[PDB]
Structures are given as C-alpha cells and as structure tokens.
C-alpha cells in the first residue's frame, strides 16, 4: 500500500515535444470533405 | 471581529405568512444536441418513407 519502491530513483521533469497529438473530433457533430 | 460564522438555517413554521412558507424548487436543466437524446416524452414512432 504505501510502500516504497526501494530501487526506484526520482528524474528531473524533461519535457518532450509532440507533432499532431492533441487533434481530435470535437463532439458527435459530422463533417466530412470540409474544412471547419 | 471581522469573523461571521455563515452556516445558518432558513426559519420553517407552520404558522409562518406566505413569506416564510418554504418552497421546494427543483430546476430543471437540460443540454441541446450535445449527445443523443435518451429522455423522450411517449410519443409513438412511425415508418420511414
Ligand atoms: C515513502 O517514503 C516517504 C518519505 O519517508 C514517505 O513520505 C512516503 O509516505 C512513503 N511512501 C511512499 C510510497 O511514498
């Protein structure tokens, strides 16, 4: 439950860069062959 | 000072005037083609044409 890990060793929070992630379908709304 | 406990209650008697009467309000909320509709009144359907 509340036991450590013993060999886990904290990291410093890198950052990393995405590309297209983040995109998606806005709601149940279709559209198709369109640019909204 | 400059220290106000807010927790209190509304006065309910039933001898109270119309004023102090307590009245239960149920507002009713609602979304508009958010989502498909699952609450519908008995509206019987019909066929497609
Ligand atoms: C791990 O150790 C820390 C420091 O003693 C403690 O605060 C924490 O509750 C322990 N448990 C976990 C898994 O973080």
């Given at each position: 439950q509340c036991v450590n890990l013993t060999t886990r060793t904290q990291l410093p929070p890198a950052y990393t860069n995405s590309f297209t992630?983040?995109?998606?379908?806005?709601?149940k709304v279709f559209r198709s062959s369109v640019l909204h | 000072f400059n220290c106000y406990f807010p927790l209190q209650s509304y006065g309910f008697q039933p001898t109270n005037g119309v004023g102090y009467q307590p009245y239960r309000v149920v507002v009713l909320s609602f979304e508009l083609l958010?989502?498909?509709?699952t609450v519908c009144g008995p509206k019987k359907s019909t066929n497609l044409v």
């Open positions: 992630r983040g995109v998606y379908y806005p709601d | 958010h989502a498909p509709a």
